[PDB]
Amino acid sequence: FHYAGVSAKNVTLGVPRLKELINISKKPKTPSLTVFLLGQSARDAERAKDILCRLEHTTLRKVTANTAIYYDPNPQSTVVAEDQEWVNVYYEMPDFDVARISPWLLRVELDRKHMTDRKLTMEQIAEKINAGFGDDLNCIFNDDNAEKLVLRIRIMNSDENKMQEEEEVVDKMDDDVFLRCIESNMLTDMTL
Amino acid sequence: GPSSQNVTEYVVRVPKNTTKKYNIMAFNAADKVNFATWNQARLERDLSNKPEDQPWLLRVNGKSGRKFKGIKKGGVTENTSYYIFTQCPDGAFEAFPVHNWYNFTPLARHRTLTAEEAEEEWERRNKVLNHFSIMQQR
Amino acid sequence: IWGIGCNP
Amino acid sequence: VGIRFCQECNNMLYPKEDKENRILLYACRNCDYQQEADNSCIYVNKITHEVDELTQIIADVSQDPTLPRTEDHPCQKCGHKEAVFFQSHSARAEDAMRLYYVCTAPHCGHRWTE
Amino acid sequence: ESRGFVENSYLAGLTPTEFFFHAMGGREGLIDTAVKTAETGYIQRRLI
Amino acid sequence: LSEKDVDPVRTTSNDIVEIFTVLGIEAVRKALERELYHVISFDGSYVN
Amino acid sequence: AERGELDLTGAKQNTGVWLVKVPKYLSQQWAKASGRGEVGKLRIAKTQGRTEVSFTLNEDLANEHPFVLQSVGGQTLTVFTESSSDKLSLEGIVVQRAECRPA
Amino acid sequence: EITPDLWQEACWIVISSYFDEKGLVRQQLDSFDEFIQMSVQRIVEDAPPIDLQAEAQHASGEVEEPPRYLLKFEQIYLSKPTHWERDGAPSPMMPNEARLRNLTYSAPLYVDITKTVIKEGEEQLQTQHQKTFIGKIPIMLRSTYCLLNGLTDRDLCELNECPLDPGGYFIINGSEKVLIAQEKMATNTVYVFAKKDSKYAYTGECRSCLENSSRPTSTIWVSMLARGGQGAKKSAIGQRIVATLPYIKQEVPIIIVFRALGFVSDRDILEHIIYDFEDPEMMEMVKPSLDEAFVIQEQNVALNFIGSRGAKPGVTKEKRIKYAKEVLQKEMLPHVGVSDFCETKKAYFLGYMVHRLLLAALGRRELDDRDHYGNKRLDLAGPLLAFLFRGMFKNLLKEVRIYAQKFIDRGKDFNLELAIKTRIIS
Amino acid sequence: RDGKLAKPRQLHNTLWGMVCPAETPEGHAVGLVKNLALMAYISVGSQPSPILEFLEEWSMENLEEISPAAIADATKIFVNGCWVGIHKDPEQLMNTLRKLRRQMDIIVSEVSMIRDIREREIRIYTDAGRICRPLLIVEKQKLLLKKRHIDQLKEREYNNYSWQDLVASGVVEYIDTLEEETVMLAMTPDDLQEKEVAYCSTYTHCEIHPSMILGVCASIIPFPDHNQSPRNTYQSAMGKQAMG
Ligand SMILES: [Zn+2]
Ligand SMILES: [Zn+2]
């Protein structure tokens, strides 16, 4: 305390920082890294902001306004009234529904302010989720023009049809419990 | 009519002694207790020691019906008394002191996990599999 | 006792 | 959204997919009771957890001597001049210095945020 | 005034709330001194 | 450091252990000297 | 028909009873004699849309008690008696609760 | 009828009256005074009556085999501070003479002891030893039992005592000793704190005690485990609430504790925990803990679960169940109740603790401050000497029991006067 | 004393009027050894039974049927621990309790009754350790202390009027830290109670005199408000060492 606030970043100073340096502690109280920019990004603020976004950890929780799990029996049923349009669009030429579709729907809704602050893209988030998790999680993303940024996630189509698994016809972690586990993993570990 | 201005006043009688003691039987509202199906009931002192200062066990309609457990009220009414007013042909209210207060709570007539199996199941706290299927297996 | 930047 | 209890043993119901009719159910694990799901929604999580604290504000709060009050903002219902105002008074309220107002005078208890 | 600002000077004399808040600040300084001595002594012994 | 548009020459961290594992023992020698000098001279005090 | 059987005839007849909380001075006054068969008079006066209940203390006993009603919809109460002949019985169901307060 | 701008005289007149009635050391004195009277009687009353009979195996036959000896401590008495000279004649001891001669300013303590003996012939005999001397209690100076009490300054000067001396200290071995009030956390109060490095995100503690009659504190924790730990089911369930009940080796799930109190149904447990069922956030908070305790659905099973985790295992199953039940009735939430049907009250208070933890977790209430002096109490001379006398009187009863048991196994007789060791208390 | 944490030692706000801010030892025990303020009193303890009987008489239904009900039953009456029921009307109960504290029937001067309007709890603590101080009582904007009481106290001897009569009249009241949390105080009657630009118009109590926040050793310091704060601690320590 009483450190002059040149920047909005606290730094250990005084006896505690001398203790940290002298003890060579593995865990500093305030580990910090000063980064200098090589090119014109140093001069121009927008490019510096781009570098800042590329260097700052962002989880899906930071950009997610609210998450809900709806049991949707049919994709065409569209239990949520809003998705009825865009779901239809995606199911005008349905993809990956050939195996099956999950009866449970994770309808994540993202805050536009956070998305635009981090300059994230719906295609970017959807690609990260779908590619990292694999074909098991199928994601439907809204247009940015739509008032609500909605990502509709469903569990593995082949796992739902169970032809691919074969083996024994026994539910593992049911489906909604597995979906909640997936939601927690996305919230804290997406690393978008 | 007379119902809009009726005034009823009745005599109060308190006999010194009654052959049958008076108690209070209280059921929780959420239990939805119904006496129409109460064809028979059995109220007796518990045997959990496997008398007058022990809880009560009620078994309605034998084993097929619901069972209830009643416990006397721990807080004594050192500064309070409760009386019950009952209609009688003479038209006078009769007040009887409440000897005891009992709160009866039901026990489901459902299959009950054995203690050994319950301990074995708790050994596997992380029940990744559905618990409903586990209950069906038991 | 002075301010936030000084002493207590 | 909410939690509902069984009608026989008063235990907690759990959601279960009906594989034949594709209709969500709630079944008690300790008995055979089943009831169809009317809401069709199960797990809702608000990460921003934006909740109007007017639901969490008690009208009785208008009786506290230690709270500040102003006559500038009148009540909507009764048009009473006194109004006792206070901040969030809640942890994890994000950042909110908004003043919430509670109407003085008996039993009105109207709460407005400006 | 509520959160601790003392507008009176020492010559003028602190008002009662200002007096209590000034006592809080002085107490913090004294605690800092007393706690400091031991940690610095340990560091000096280690270095030597 | 390896991110694009980040100067590899001048980007530094306060953590001496990270400086060790990444840049070497001589780099730590210098970085530890820099950190100690900063904590000593923040008060304005000078140590040779 | 057994020793543990509960005589549910009162429940079948749906006999309604009133439960009242009364203070210790009133109960002790009643218990003083307790054998004269009389302790006071309960007077209930009903109006177009309001009813009031009061109890008058016996003049001999003294040498007004308004009653306040309480809702009984939150809990179902019944009264049962254990006869000295080990014949349990049910007297009725509580349909109203009241409290007696000093004047 | 007002006193405006004349206030400087008024405030100091009322302060003068305050300090004229009381003085500065009224804490110490008052505490000690209260202690003596109330505390000693209470302790003497609260200690269990001594029960005693000869061993059945020692003597053949049952005619005189149970000679029950029952000792009850009826009433307490304190004389004025007294010194017993070498000749043995009692003399009043003035404080100044105690300082000069290096004596202790103390008063004798007499207890009426009633010995009732049942010889199995149903002819129980009650003999009352009145004014039995059990020890000497040091007397705080200028307290109600000090000789200097109620003496005008002239009389104090006659005794070579200062009129201005405050008192509030004891003369022990000729030295003046002052009991220093000891700060402590308040008892019978639920406090929710947050520990950063703990495995629990929040912990609610109640340092419950039954009017300090016994067991200085019986602390019980209800803590919500942190969600930081990552696992498949761990991520699915979220934060779970556990209870660190006293006399139990490890954590116990809270719903199991509620079912051990006889509340098996989940609806009733939540009725105690969640006072408003309509609020969805708290119900969602409580759901994982219900999931954890889904296995145990019976009171007996929950009692067995508690007993298995007890500090000392019970070989028999029903032994474990009975041990857990008695441990809950005595050790857990003693201030709420200790016997009979206090189980509903204990369930309601434990539900309050869980509810307060839930409010803290949801942010609806702020975390308690340990430094807030409302959460603090000060043990003066009274509580400290009361704790001391509890311990020493229990030891005195123990020694009386030992001597009595020896002489009773002989069957000769027992004498109260020889059993009592005044050394213990003094 | 070994612990170097600077949390338990700092002068807390709640120490106002009950522990001397200046008088503390310096060294390993800074802020850990404290001294009572001049007017501070420490509760001796009382039996909670008469309070519980009064509460039962007023209302406080215990063993109710989940009646809290989003605390529809405003406030839950606590005692020294021990939730003993709840009441539908909390303000009438609190006013009745204060009147009883004045009449000294069931509530001794030491009995402390706290209502938390939000969170709806009333605590009613009488537990033998609470540190409390006397504060004058302000009804409306007028102190209850009036010229009659001051004149009778001024004639104190041969008038048999004392502080206890001032307490019995209801002019002054003992307030502990928990109640200090729920009380609006005025440092001075004239400066604060009197009508001005209205800071507060709901003062419930008034300080008898601010200087009483100091202890015995700091009370000898003349003009202590004109010195730096550590210097008053130093003077407390040194006045314990003066020869007289
Ligand atoms: Zn069920
Ligand atoms: Zn209004």
Q: What is the DSSP string of E1-48?
A: -TTS---S-TTT---HHHHHHHHHHHHHHHHHHHHHHHHHHHHHHHH-
Read off φ and ψ for residue D80, nearest 5 degrees: -80, 140
3-state helix, strand, coil in chain D (%, to 5): 5, 30, 65
**Among the listed residues I14, I18, I116, I96, the one whose alpha carbon sits nearest the alpha carbon of residue I54:** I96
Q: What residues in I contact G74, CB-CB < 8 Å? A: 65-67
Residue given tokens 């209800």 in the structure block: H222
Residue among B29, B73, B80 whose CB faces I56 most closely: B80
Q: What is the number of structural domains in chain A?
A: 1
Burial class (CB in 10 A: 0-12, 13-18, 19+), H35: buried
Rounded Cα gap, residues E9 and A123, in angstroms: 63
Q: What residues in C contact E26, CB-CB < 8 Å? A: 1, 8
Residues D58 and D95 in one domain: yes
Rounded Cα gap, residues D18 and D11, in angstroms: 21
Give domain status of residue A96, yes or no. yes
Handedness of CA I83, I88, I93, I94 (dihedral sign): positive
The chains found to touch I (3+ Cβ pairs under 8 angstroms) are: B, D, E, G, H
Q: Are strands A138-141 and A64-71 parallel, antiparallel or unpaired?
A: unpaired
- Nearest ligand to the CA atom of D112: 2
Q: Give how far Cα H372 sits from Cα of D85, H380, I11, I97, Å.
A: 25, 19, 10, 25
A68 touches chain H (CB under 8 A): no
Residues 141-170 of A with CB under 8 A from F: none
Q: What residues in G contact I66, CB-CB < 8 Å? A: 74
The reply to whether D41 sits in an annotated binding site is no
Q: Which two tokens stand for residue A8?
A: 């909005």
H283 touches chain D (CB under 8 A): yes
Q: What residues in D contact B30, CB-CB < 8 Å? A: 10
3-state secondary structure chain H: CCCCCCHHHHHHHHHHHHHHHCCCCHHHHHHHHHHHHHHHHHHHHHCCCEEECCCCCCCCCCCCCCCEEEEEEEEEEECCCEEECCCCCEEECCHHHHHHCCCCCEEEEEEEEEEEEECCCCCCEEEEEEEEEEEEEECCCCCCCCCCCCCCHHHHHHCCCCCCCCCCCEEECCEEECCCCEEEECCCCEEEECCCCCCEEEEEEEEECCCCCCCCCEEEEEEEECCCCCCHHHHHHCCCEEEECCCECCCEEHHHHHHHCCCCCHHHHHHHHCCCCCCHHHHHHHHHHHHHCCCCCCHHHHHHHHHHCECCCCCCHHHHHHHHHHHHHHCCCCCCCCCCCCHHHHHHHHHHHHHHHHHHHHCCCCCCCCCCHHHEEEECHHHHHHHHHHHHHHHHHHHHHHHHHHHHHHCCCCCHHHHCCHHHHC
Q: Give how far Cα B25 sits from Cα of A42, B96, D13, G13, I65, Å.
A: 81, 15, 29, 17, 14
N- to C-terminal Cα distance for chain G?
Answer: 50
User: How many C-beta atoms lie closer than 10 Å to residue B131's C-beta?
Assistant: 16
Q: Are strands G16-22 and G88-100 parallel, antiparallel or unpaired?
A: parallel
Contact D66 I182 (CB under 8 A): yes
Residues D4 and D28 in one domain: yes
- What domain range includes position B53? 1-138
Q: Which two tokens stand for residue F47?
A: 């140590």
Mutate which of I60, I65, I84 to test chain B, going by most B C-beta atoms within 10 A? I65
Residue given tokens 């300013």 in the structure block: H105
G71 touches chain B (CB under 8 A): no
Q: Which two tokens stand for residue I45?
A: 């303890």
CA-derived radius of gyration, chain D:
22
Angle at I232 (CA atoms; ends I228, I237), nearest 5 degrees: 145
Residue H175 exposure: Cα atoms within 13 Å on the Cβ side? 4
CB H262, CB H343: distance < 8 Å: yes
- CA G55 to chain CA centroid, Å, is 12
Query: Which chain D residue shows the shortest CA-CA distance from A73?
Result: D22
Resolution given for this structure, in angstroms: 2.7
N- to C-terminal Cα distance for chain F?
Answer: 32
G76 touches chain I (CB under 8 A): no
Residue A164 exposure: Cα atoms within 13 Å on the Cβ side? 11
Rounded Cα gap, residues H301 and B118, in angstroms: 8
Handedness of CA I97, I103, I106, I107 (dihedral sign): positive
Q: Give how far Cα B50 sits from Cα of B47, B109, H109, H321, Å.
A: 6, 22, 48, 12
CB D27, CB D43: distance < 8 Å: no
Read off φ and ψ for residue A144, nearest 5 degrees: -65, -25
- What domain range includes position A147? 50-192
D30 touches chain B (CB under 8 A): yes
Give domain status of residue A2, yes or no. no
Q: State the DSSP H helix or E strand holding residue I148, giving kind and residue range, or none if neither.
A: helix I147-154
User: How many C-beta atoms lie closer than 10 Å to residue H270's C-beta?
Assistant: 25
- Count interface pairs A-E at CB distance under 8 A: 10
Residues D21 and D54 in one domain: no
Q: How many residues does chain I have?
A: 244
User: How many C-beta atoms lie closer than 10 Å to residue F9's C-beta?
Assistant: 8
Contact E39 A22 (CB under 8 A): no
CA of D70 to the centre of ligand 2 (A): 13
Q: What residues in B contact I65, CB-CB < 8 Å? A: 28-29
Q: What residues in I contact E23, CB-CB < 8 Å? A: 11, 21-22, 229, 232
Rounded Cα gap, residues D80 and D103, in angstroms: 7
I61 touches chain B (CB under 8 A): no
The chains found to touch A (3+ Cβ pairs under 8 angstroms) are: B, C, D, E, F, H
The reply to whether D31 sits in an annotated binding site is yes
**Among the listed residues I167, I168, I173, I87, the one whose alpha carbon sits nearest the alpha carbon of residue I138:** I173
In the three-class reduction of DSSP (H, G, I as helix; E, B as strand; rest coil), residue I182 is classed as coil
**What CATH number has the domain bearing residue H357?**
3.90.1110.10
Q: What is the number of structural domains in chain D?
A: 2
The chains found to touch H (3+ Cβ pairs under 8 angstroms) are: A, B, D, I
Q: What experimental approach yielded this model?
A: cryo-EM
Residues D32 and D57 in one domain: no
Residues 1-48 of E with CB under 8 A from A: 36, 39-40, 43, 46-47
- What domain range includes position D38? 1-45
Give domain status of residue A133, yes or no. yes
Amino acid at I54: F
**What CATH number has the domain bearing residue A62?**
3.30.1360.140
Contact B71 H264 (CB under 8 A): no
Read off φ and ψ for residue G69, nearest 5 degrees: -80, 155
Q: What is the number of structural domains in chain B?
A: 1
Rounded Cα gap, residues I35 and I57, in angstroms: 41
Q: Give how far Cα H111 sits from Cα of B1, H136, H416, I216, Å.
A: 75, 12, 11, 41
